[PDB]
């Protein structure tokens with residue numbers, strides 16, 4: 001009983017430590033046998049995200065060292081994108097962490113996302129590059145449609161034109177692009193606040 005109560009408080013302390021500095025928080029949890037030091041177990045901890053700031057989760061997933069890269073891979077693997085369209089998948093992924101203005105880190109994260117989306121849905125995009133480019137197209141479209149600071153609201157026809165030639169030199173099916181455009185137009189991305 002006393003061991004359990006002590007462990008519960010130390011877990012809570014570990015979460016607070018993580019929010020101050022992700023690597024120190026994970027270190028405390030691992031060193032106190034509250035979390036196993038495996039990429040999969042760390043990833044599951046971050047995916048659950050209990051009491052964890054989404055900016056802190058993003059920071060940890062964005063680190064360059066081997067273990068953090070492995071955690072990123074395992075974290076993306078916890079996402080189940082089978083039979084979801086690209087927007088549905090992005091809604092889930094983009095809600096799970098936050099990391100603005102770190103280009104190289106976002107590149108790694110979005111490449112991992114694109115690879116996972118395509119593995120889950122092999123018939124949609126034959127090229128993962130197509131998936132990556134279209135993923136950013138949808139993010140850009142969300143901002144263009146829903147941020148009043150941009151006065152050019154691109155219509156469907158413009159969105160279609162902007163994506164020409166990215167499907168192995170051909171175009172994406174028009175209905176795929178329409179479905180993605182309409183999904184974003186009717187429901188903006190829910191993006192985690194800076195926490």
Ligand SMILES: Cc1cc(O)cc(C)c1NS(=O)(=O)c1ccccc1
Nearest residue numbers: 094097098099100101106139143191
């Ligand atoms: C997805 C998003 C869109 C925004 O308009 C603002 C933010 C903070 C986010 N999150 S974001 O971490 O900056 C980001 C994640 C993945 C790709 C691009 C950006």
